[PDB]
User: Which sequence fits this backbone?
């Protein structure tokens, strides 16, 4: 029959006797009611991990296995609401809207089922939108030491999707409840929370609660990709997940490997990030049952990895780099020295690259990459009583004021419009001639003003990157005109 | 109502009737020799048996023996009756008996992780210490790492920080002595009774002396006492003698329970053990606990998990420099090296942030010129730079201060300065002003005008 | 024929009573929540039970359902019928055309060709890559290996090799991605379908997204195709992404398969699991196999067992280091730790050899001086050693060159260098001809005549 009784419980692990027609991955239901996931199906007993508190579960407690395995309310009613790792568990309103359910564990779409990523996901930060473009259905790492702006960069990329049609998802894993609370309060303040659902598993919650949260949050975003809609999820701290999984792995007595992590830790992150991808027209049609009848959905995903002392060659960081098709190193010392979008060029990459950017972007952004990784090559000068100036003096003085351009404050996303700044003003010659360093950053802000008035047309170029053969010369004008304001 | 079956070190195993087997974190109590032997259940081991840790010496325990389970998940005395008195893990009066006439008694194993019980403020905890409030401000309901050690007045900084939230703020503070020397514990008790702050701190001890069970749980017993004052409506200070000893104690237990070794031989449960201790100290919308904890970085590797974990929780760091102490500036806090992510942001406010960042430069610029001066002429230093070395020379004498708890040591009253007078005073100094006052002017006194009057007295 | 007894992740064991205890390596199916689920017998455990590995998600398997046993080891098609498109580890058509496929069929488990049946040649093929062609060449019927940590261009390197030699090929190619990103595979298929070159290639994809079973077997289903093509047509290319992903798969399982862990938690059978698969790829008397393959190195540790043991099985071994990438050299080959068994004077002529070892020497002599430079500066070297580092730093960045495939994410258009020019340039720089030119003249260019023209612009 389909019932059982808890024989032993310790450290969140549970050993149920009976449960004949229980199956692998099935979500057993307990008193409370909490659940528990069947990981083992031994000859007699059944190993399961409690999905929540376990401080009160005792022997002889009745266990009644449910029908299906490990799924949780996906749908479209989820956004605007913070959700507990397992599922519906709400904050703070009572109800929630299922479209249905969806397995938290799942196979990533096939190989033949795919469509090369063409579309762009603007982060708002000019430093990343130029040199390291993110595209629809791409995995981009956000790796760096503690307190370098990893989290801040993630939420800004969400805030900038407040009306791009892209649905967002934030997954707090082992994060301080205080921090997660203040992230959502600022998610609504700066507008909008409504476009983004936020799965949360605070630092005090179960280890199983933490390590499953990424998958739960993922399946919720997967609903959109299959549907022909585009989406964006950011797994906060996959480092806090891997450490949570290592806890359960070692409690289950699984043999440790490198850095005491279970050998399958790669598979842990692999099957998760592999979920994020772009699905081609046919797949969306088959899934939608002919309702969507001709559209491509996608789940863009950028995870966060917290390195220790810049040791990028650590086990977990290396695996996540091996998985993702690009990364973004936030340097600890660049960050200290004011360069806040601490992105380190020459080491940060986006392998999808060119395709991931708009037309007006990859045309201009080509010249921005060269100067930045090659202005820090001759960092030796430190801009001094000059030498070889015509060459060394120019390239340095120019480069030093481009890095000051890439510098940004958070919560201030530059659209493809204010890209006029980066595109023109910098690369070719403009700002380099007049503005001094300090005026170098300021002038940009007031330029953005003079176009807000004298460039409602340019509202069309941020509609289509175009950069038509004519538009080249057209923009050249608005810049010279600004040399008559400020 | 139960029989002991196995006894190995502090790990005694007791088996019970299968119908009423003890909950995980509940306490038991054997009677061995004279004293009882409270036990903490740890695992619902199979076969109707239960595995426990001894809140005392397991020595003398005969195999077959009676132990009565109770519903109490090992609860302790909480309330305004505790302060001024010392207690061990079990909430017993360890100080020479006063009998700790309680009023209530809370479990130490509660889950204080709340949601929407936690506020949205991000309010700052005004400490009254100039150095701190400006250079490394506290967050109300935040955690702050206290790096220092001996010879830097680390004790007096605690005592002052203790009386300050006691007088200029409503609440009180709880001290939790986990894992350090017993000799110190005594000296500290007398330093508090002399500085007359003892009356306002509840203190809990679990020295190196006591078994692993005590050290591992002693933090929580002190934590809950503070949690009591929190739901009571107050803001409180939770001192942890050494959080490192807490996590290290968790390793001894995890080892006795036979759990596997994780990275660098730590427990696989240290990621969670930390997240619970910390996540319980926060600012709810009914009160707030704010904690300053002495940190220990093993082999000076802040990459080691014991630090590297505890660090992802801290919201501030107060660094006591021995060289800064040498000179004479006596909140020995090093203005740089002392970090606080509650200042970095907008959140304090722009004016405070820039004044803060402003001192972090004039104070640093002064170092680079400090060896271009020893080796070269101070005169060949440009105008604005030796005026920087003139101003920096002065801010560093200002951000010194006399403490109240120090009046017994010294004789000088000392005082408490707001965040505002501190900003006014420091911003005022560094942006063209008070240049006419002597450097002596700014030793050891409160708001800037206190220093201005110090100039006439000269 | 039998029923489930246990289920632990990918490992499920089945009771089959004596009559038909499945042969050790043999298939068998199971009906789960919906569809067919192939298990592969791994160990004839005592008592009529048998350990297997799910070739699909083991989730949703009941503890008792029946399982049918067939006599076929593994069903994978072989021959020209496969050239068309992508396959599964099970030999199923993963793409959207119901395969016309097999005139025959082979088991994925095979034996290594007989010793005396093994051939070998010395007809060197020419890759476009300057580093590879100079530092480590290979004849057709060779085993090339690309070692590198994460993010060292591991993939893009293989794809550039492919585009360079899959043209001079005029033959049958067999790519077999295993444990890789699916996004790359989709692009490789579409990219190769537009160039219309699919009809001479043959795909098979076991993703890093698929369950463990698929991964450690897909490597076998991959080359068992190239083997068929070999034992008939003579010249085949075999590209494999991450042989490590195959070994790594075998590790996730080794625990559940119930064997003690070897060094660093690896399987005790690492020595053989590698050798079996690796020994399969070889030049037969009947037909040879040219093969490059991306062997991942965990956490950058070249001492890690996977890489350490994998080394012996390679003819040419080019290794990519993160240090060389961190500079800007993006054929990130370490020209020192990278070698070939055929950098032999009698094989590659004396001019190529002397040039290769000359370049190797001065580049190593530089690594020695690197220490004193960092501590005492350049001005401490003799005028001779001074010239050594200068000449070396030219070589160091003449090794670099933009790949065509890499144009996508970098503005730099690709280039292709003759094995003839590669010698002309380096031999040249070493002689001291191109000294006057600055270093940047050599960074990221094709033939030396490009370094010259770049020196003009700057
Ligand atoms: N673009 C930015 N401009 C200005 N300040 C920034 C910017 N990005 C980050 N910061 C500051 O960086 C501090 C912390 O950033 P944060 O997002 O927490 O980094 P994180 O690496 O996620 N740190 P942690 O939570 O410990 O892992 C905040 O105080 C921010 O003010
Ligand atoms: Mg963060």
Assistant:
């Amino acid at each position: 029959h389909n019932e059982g009784t808890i024989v032993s419980v310790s450290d969140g692990v549970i050993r149920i006797h009976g449960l004949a027609d229980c199956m692998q991955g099935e979500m057993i239901s307990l008193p409370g009611n909490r659940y528990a996931i069947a990981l083992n199906l031994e000859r007699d007993s059944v190993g399961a991990v409690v999905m929540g508190p376990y401080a009160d579960l005792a022997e002889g407690m009745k266990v009644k296995c449910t029908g299906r395995i490990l799924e949780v309310p996906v749908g479209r009613g989820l956004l605007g609401r913070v959700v507990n790792t397992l599922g519906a568990p709400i904050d703070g309103k009572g109800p929630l809207d299922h479209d249905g359910f969806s397995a938290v564990e799942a196979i990533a779409p096939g190989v033949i089922e795919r469509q090369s990523v063409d579309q762009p996901v603007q982060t708002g930060y000019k430093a990343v939108d130029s040199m390291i473009p993110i595209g629809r259905g791409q995995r981009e790492l956000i790796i760096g030491d503690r307190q370098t702006g990893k989290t801040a960069l993630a939420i800004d990329a969400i805030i900038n999707q407040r009306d791009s049609g892209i649905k967002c998802i934030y997954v707090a894993i082992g994060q301080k409840a205080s921090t997660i609370s203040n992230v959502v309060r600022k998610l609504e303040e700066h507008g909008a929370l409504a476009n983004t659902i936020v799965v949360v598993a605070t630092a005090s919650e179960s280890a199983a609660l933490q390590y499953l949260a990424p998958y739960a949050g993922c399946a919720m975003g997967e609903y959109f990709r299959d549907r022909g809609e585009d989406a964006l999820i950011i797994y906060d701290d996959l480092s806090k997940q891997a450490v949570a999984y290592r806890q359960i792995s070692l409690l289950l007595r699984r043999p440790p490997g490198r850095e005491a992590f279970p050998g399958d830790v790669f598979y842990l992150h692999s099957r998760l990030l592999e979920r994020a991808a772009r699905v081609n027209a046919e797949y969306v049609e088959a899934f939608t049952k002919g309702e969507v009848k001709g559209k491509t959905g996608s789940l863009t995903a950028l995870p966060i990895i917290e390195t220790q002392a810049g040791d990028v060659s650590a086990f977990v960081p290396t695996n996540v780099i091996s998985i993702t098709d690009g990364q973004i190193f936030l340097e600890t010392n660049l960050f200290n020295a004011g360069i806040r979008p601490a992105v380190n060029p020459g080491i940060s990459v986006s392998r999808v690259g060119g395709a991931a950017q708009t037309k007006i972007m990859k045309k201009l952004s080509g010249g921005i990459r060269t100067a930045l990784a090659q202005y820090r090559e001759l960092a030796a000068f430190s801009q001094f009583a000059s030498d070889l100036d015509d060459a060394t003096r120019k390239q340095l003085d120019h480069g030093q004021k481009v890095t000051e351009l890439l510098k940004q404050k958070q919560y201030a996303p530059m659209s493809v419009a204010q890209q006029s700044l980066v595109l023109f003003a910098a690369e070719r010659g403009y700002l380099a001639d007049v503005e001094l360093s300090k005026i170098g950053s300021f002038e940009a802000a007031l330029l953005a003003y003079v176009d807000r008035d004298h460039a409602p047309l340019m509202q069309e170029i941020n509609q289509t990157g175009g950069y038509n053969d004519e538009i080249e010369g057209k923009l050249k004008g608005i810049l010279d005109s600004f040399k008559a304001t400020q | 109502t139960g029989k002991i079956v196995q006894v190995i070190g502090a790990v005694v195993d007791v088996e019970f009737p299968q119908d009423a087997v003890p909950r995980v974190y509940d306490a038991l109590e054997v009677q061995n020799g004279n004293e009882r032997l409270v036990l903490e259940v740890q695992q619902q081991l199979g076969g109707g048996i239960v595995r426990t840790i001894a809140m005392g010496s397991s020595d003398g325990l005969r195999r077959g023996l009676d132990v009565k389970d109770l519903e109490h998940p090992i609860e302790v005395p909480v309330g305004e009756a505790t302060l001024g008195r010392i207690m061990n893990v079990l909430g017993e009066p360890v100080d020479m008996k006063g009998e700790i006439g309680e009023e209530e008694r809370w479990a130490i194993h509660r889950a204080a992780p709340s949601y929407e019980e936690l506020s949205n403020s991000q309010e700052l905890l005004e400490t009254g210490i100039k150095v701190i409030d400006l250079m490394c401000p506290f967050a109300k309901g935040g955690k702050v790492g206290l790096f220092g050690g001996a010879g830097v007045g680390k004790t007096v900084n605690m005592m002052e920080l203790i009386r300050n939230i006691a007088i200029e703020h409503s609440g009180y503070s709880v001290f939790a002595g986990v894992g350090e020397r017993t000799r110190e514990g005594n000296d500290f008790y007398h330093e508090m009774t002399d500085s007359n702050v003892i009356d306002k701190v509840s203190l809990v001890y679990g020295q190196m002396n006591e078994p692993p069970g005590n050290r591992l749980r002693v933090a929580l017993t002190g934590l809950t006492m503070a949690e009591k004052f929190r739901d009571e409506g107050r803001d409180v200070l939770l001192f942890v003698d050494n959080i490192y000893r807490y996590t290290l104690a968790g390793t001894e237990v995890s080892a006795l329970l036979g759990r596997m070794p994780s990275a660098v031989g730590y427990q696989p449960t240290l990621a969670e053990e930390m997240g619970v201790l910390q996540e319980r100290i926060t600012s709810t919308k009914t009160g707030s606990i704010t904690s300053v904890q002495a940190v220990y970085v093993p082999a000076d590797d802040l990459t080691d998990p014991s630090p590297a974990t505890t660090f992802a929780h801290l919201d501030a760091t107060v660094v006591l420099s021995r060289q800064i102490a040498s000179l004479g500036i006596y909140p020995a806090v090093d203005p740089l090296d002392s970090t606080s992510r509650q200042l970095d942001p907008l959140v304090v406010g722009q004016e405070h942030y820039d004044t803060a960042r402003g001192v972090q430069s004039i104070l640093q610029r002064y170092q680079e010129l400090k060896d271009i001066i020893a080796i070269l002429g101070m005169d060949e230093l440009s105008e604005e730079d030796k005026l920087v070395v003139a101003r920096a020379r002065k801010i560093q004498r200002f951000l010194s201060q006399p403490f109240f708890v120090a009046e017994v040591f010294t004789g000088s009253p000392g005082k408490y300065v707001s965040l505002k007078d501190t900003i006014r005073g420091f911003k005022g100094i560094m942006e063209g002003e008070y240049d006419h006052l002597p450097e002596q002017a700014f030793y050891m006194v409160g708001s800037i005008e206190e220093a201005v009057e110090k100039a006439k007295k000269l």
